Amino acid sequence: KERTFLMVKPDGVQRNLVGEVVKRFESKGLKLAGAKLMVISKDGAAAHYAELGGGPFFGGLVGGATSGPVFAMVWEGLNAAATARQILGATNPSDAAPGTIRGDFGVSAGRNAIHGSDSAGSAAKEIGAFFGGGEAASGTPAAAADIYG
Amino acid sequence: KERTFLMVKPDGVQRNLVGEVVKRFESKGLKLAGAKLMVISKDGAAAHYAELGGGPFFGGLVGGATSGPVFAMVWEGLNAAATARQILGATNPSDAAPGTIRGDFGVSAGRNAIHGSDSAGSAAKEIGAFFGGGEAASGTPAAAADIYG
Amino acid sequence: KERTFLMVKPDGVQRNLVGEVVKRFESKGLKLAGAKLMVISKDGAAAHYAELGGGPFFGGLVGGATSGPVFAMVWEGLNAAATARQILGATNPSDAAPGTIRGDFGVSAGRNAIHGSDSAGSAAKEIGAFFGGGEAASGTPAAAADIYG
Amino acid sequence: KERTFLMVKPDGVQRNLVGEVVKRFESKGLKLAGAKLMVISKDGAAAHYAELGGGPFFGGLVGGATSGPVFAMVWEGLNAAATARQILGATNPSDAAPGTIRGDFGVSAGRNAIHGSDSAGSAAKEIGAFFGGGEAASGTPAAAADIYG
Amino acid sequence: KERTFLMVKPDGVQRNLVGEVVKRFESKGLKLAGAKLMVISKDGAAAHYAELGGGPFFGGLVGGATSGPVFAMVWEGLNAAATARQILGATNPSDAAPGTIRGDFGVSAGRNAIHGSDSAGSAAKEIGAFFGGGEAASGTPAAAADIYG
Amino acid sequence: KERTFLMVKPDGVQRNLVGEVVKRFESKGLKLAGAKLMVISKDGAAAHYAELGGGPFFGGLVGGATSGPVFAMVWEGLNAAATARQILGATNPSDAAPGTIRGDFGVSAGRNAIHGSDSAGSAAKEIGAFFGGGEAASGTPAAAADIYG
C-alpha cells in the first residue's frame, strides 16, 4: 500500500548496520519495493536537504551524506511512513527511545544511521528524487495476508 | 578488492530474510558495492541460468526466480567470492552446514534463500548481467584496516 | 508465583514468531508453567471473546483466532501479569513501544502476534478456559534465586 | 508432511533456551504441529529410554529427565526428521558442530538441551508416547509455499 | 571523551548476561576503557553504597553485590554517562522501558543486571574506587569518526 | 574446573565484537574467572609470541597486538580449553567453520578476532603471563548444576 522513502546514511553503511536496519522492517511487515546504493554526489544532496540551506549545518551536513555510499529504499504497507519514523527513532540518537535503529545504533545527531520521510508528501517527493518509477518492483509479498485484514 | 555477485532469490525476499542475509556479510567484512531489487523478467533469467537449459529443472526453475523480486548485490574484499560460498552454504539446504544462510534458512534445493558466484569468472559475468558499471559505488569503507593487513 | 495466561494468536504462529515470543519471557525471568497448541475451535473463542459480542469486530475477530493454531501458555513469577502486558506492548502494534513483541512484530490491531491477561482476575479465568490443572508442571526453575530475593 | 518428535530436556527448559530452540526450527521451515510441557513422571521415561536399561547410565539418566518439565514437540515438512538431527547437533555437545542447539548451548553429553528422533520409525513411536492424536493441530502454515515446490 | 563507570552486578554475571550487556554499548558507540572481574569484598561495597547506610535495604543490599563476581567497566564518548542510564533502563526492571538491559533482563529492583553512574561526579568517583589509573587503556578506537563529528 | 586463557585481539575490540565474543561462551557454559583490558605493551607480546620469533611474521605480528587494547579472559568448566578452540574456529577465518567467532567475524589470518590456548599447558602459561592469581574471582556460578552432572 502506502510507500515511504528511507535510506541508510553513509555512517550506518560504514558501521556495517545495513543488514539489521533492512531486517528491522522485514520482520515488521514493511515491504521492500526497490533499494540500491546510489550516492548523493552533492547535487542530489543540496536538493534533498534544500530546506534551510541558509542554516550553518548545511556546511558540514552536505559534507557528510556525500562521503560514503547510501543504501536508499522504498517501503510498503498501511501506515508504513507513519510507523517507520516511530521505529526509526527520535532525530537525536542520544534522546531516541531504546529499541529503535537510532537509540540502539547512534550517539550523535550529526550522523544517525538512517533517514526516513516525515510526512506522505515528503515521502512522495523523496522516492522520486532518489528512485524513479521502473527501479521499483510491484511484487506481491507472499505473507502479507498474515499481517493486515 | 575482488568482487562477487550474490543475490537473494525470490523466496528469501518473501521469507523476510533480506536484512539478515545482507548483514551476515557486513559483520564478516565483505563490502556492499551496489545492490537493488531488479527482477529477472524471464529474459534476464534464461541467460543467467543458460547453462543446462536442456535439463528438465529449467521448467520450474526459471518459473521460480521470475515470481517475486530479487535483491541483487556485489561484494568486495580479498577472497570475497571464495569465502562467500563457504558461508552461503552447500547448494542443498537440507545438506548445508548449520551456521550458513542455507542451513539456517532453507529446507529445499528448489528455492534456497540466496545465490552466489562459483568462481571469479562466473563472478565477472554475473555482476555485469545484473548490474552495470555506474550503479556501483567505489566507496572506501571506513573500517577496512581493522580486517586486512 | 503469580500466574498469567498469554498465547500467540494464529498470525504469529504463521509468522514463525513462536520461538522469539516464548524466549522473550524466558530471558526476562517469567517461568513457563505449561504450554501447547490448542486451537480455538470457535466455541473456545466466543467465550474468551465473550465481552462485547454485540460489537461488529466479533464478525471478523472470531474468524481470525480460529484459522491457524494457537500456542497457549501460562507464566510465573512476581508481577508476571503486570509486567507481561508492558513488554507485550500496547494493543495497537502501529502505536506500541519499539522493543515489544507488538511494536517489533506487528503492523495491525487486527492480528497482533500475542495475547495476554489484562488483570489477575482475567488471568485467573483465561488459564482455566484454555488449560486445566494437570497440564501445568509445578517445576521449580533452577535459576530463580538469581532474579528475586 | 513427515512428522518428528523432539523435546527440550529439563536442562534447556531450566537454562531458558526454550524460545531459541523452538525458533530455530520456525525460521528453518519446520512446522510446529503440537507442543506442551508434559513431564516424564518416571514411567514415561523408562519406556522412552527403554533401550539399554541394563546400562549403568539409566541410573542417573532417568534421574535427569524426571527433574524439571519437558517441552515436547512434533515438527512437519519434508525431511523434517532427517534434517532435524543435523541441526540438533551431534549427541556430544563438546563434539557437536558450532551452529547447532548443542554446540551452541551444551557442554555435557549428560544433559544436552534437546532430544530428537533418530529415524522415521523412532519418530513414529515417540510422537505417540508423549502426544496422542488430538493434541496435534492440522493447521496449514500460510508461508509453506515459499519453502517447498 | 567523557568517561563513566558501569558494572554488571552479581546477578547478571550469574545470569550469563555479561556478553550482551557489554555488546549493547559497543554497537552503540561507547568505548570500553578498561574492564575486569573485581569482587566487592564487603569493604568495597559499604563505601560505594555508603549513601543511606542507615536504610534497612543495606541489610540485604550489601549482601547481594558481595556474593558472585562483578564485571566492572569504564566507558567513553560524548554524553556517555547521560545516555548510558537511558539505555541502562529505569532502576526498577518491572517499570523499565522495554529495549533496555533492565526491562529485557530483570524482574526485581533488588538485583537488576547492571549498575551505572547517575551524574559526571558520581562517574568521577566510581571509576576511581573500583579501577585505578593504569588499568585503563588510552586506545583510540579505529571507528570513532563514523560516530561523532 | 579446568581453566583457559583466551583474549580478544586488538582487531575485535576495535570491531566492537567484545560483547558477542564474551557472550558466546556464557551461553555455552564456560565461566568467566577474571577479565580485563591489559594491553600487550610490546614486552608482554614478544614473550607470548616468543615461539618462532625468527619467522618474518613477527615483523608485522607483534606490531598488531600492540596497537589497540586487548580484553584478556580466563574461562572455566570441564573441557573448557578443548571445546574453546573448536568454537573459536580454525586459525584462518577464511577457512574456519561458519558458526564460530572467526568464520562469522573474520576474513584474514593476520587479525582474527580472538586468541585461545592450544593445549592445558599452553593454557597454564598464558593465564599467568597476562593475569596473576588474585585478579581471578573464585565465584561459584549459580547455574552450573544444569550443565554438568
What this model shows, in words?
Six copies of one chain form a homohexamer. Chain A is of the alpha+beta class and 149 residues long. The first copy, chain A, has one domain: Nucleoside diphosphate kinase-like domain (Alpha-Beta Plaits, 2-Layer Sandwich), CATH 3.30.70. In chain A, 35% of the residues lie in helices and 13% in strands. The first copy, chain A, is built from seven helices and four strands, in the order βααβααβααβα. Chain A has a four-stranded antiparallel β-sheet. At the A-B interface, helix 2 and strand 2 of A face helix 2 and strand 2 of B. Chains A, B, C, D, E, F: Homotetramer. Chains A, B, C, D, E, F: Its cofactor is Mg(2+). Chains A, B, C, D, E, F: One of its GO terms (biological process) is CTP biosynthetic process. Chains A, B, C, D, E, F: Its main location: cytoplasm. Chains A, B, C, D, E, F: Its EC number is 2.7.4.6.
Tell me the overall shape of chain A. Answer: globular
| Proportion of residues in helical segments of chain A | 25-40%
Question: Largest chain-chain contact?
Answer: A-B, 35 and 35 residues
Tell me the domain tally of chain A: 1
Question: What structural class is derived from the secondary structure elements of chain A?
Answer: alpha+beta
**CATH hierarchy class name of chain A:** Alpha Beta
Strand order of the largest sheet of chain A: 2-3-1-4
Give the terminus-to-terminus CA distance of chain A: 13 Å
The major beta sheet of chain A can be summarized as:
4 strands, antiparallel
- Helical segment count of chain A: 7
Give me the CATH architecture of chain A, please. 2-Layer Sandwich
The succession of helices and strands of chain A, N to C, reads: EHHEHHEHHEH
Count of β-strands of chain A: 4
Radius of gyration of chain A: 15 Å
| CATH homologous superfamily designation of chain A | Nucleoside diphosphate kinase-like domain
- The fold-level CATH name of chain A is Alpha-Beta Plaits
β-sheet strand percentage of chain A: 5-15%
Question: What assembly state would you assign to the polypeptide chains in this entry?
Answer: homohexamer
GO molecular function, one term (chains A, B, C, D, E, F): ATP binding
EC number (chains A, B, C, D, E, F): 2.7.4.6
Catalytic activity (chains A, B, C, D, E, F): dZDP + ATP = dZTP + ADP; a 2'-deoxyribonucleoside 5'-diphosphate + ATP = a 2'-deoxyribonucleoside 5'-triphosphate + ADP; a ribonucleoside 5'-diphosphate + ATP = a ribonucleoside 5'-triphosphate + ADP
Cofactor (chains A, B, C, D, E, F): Mg(2+)
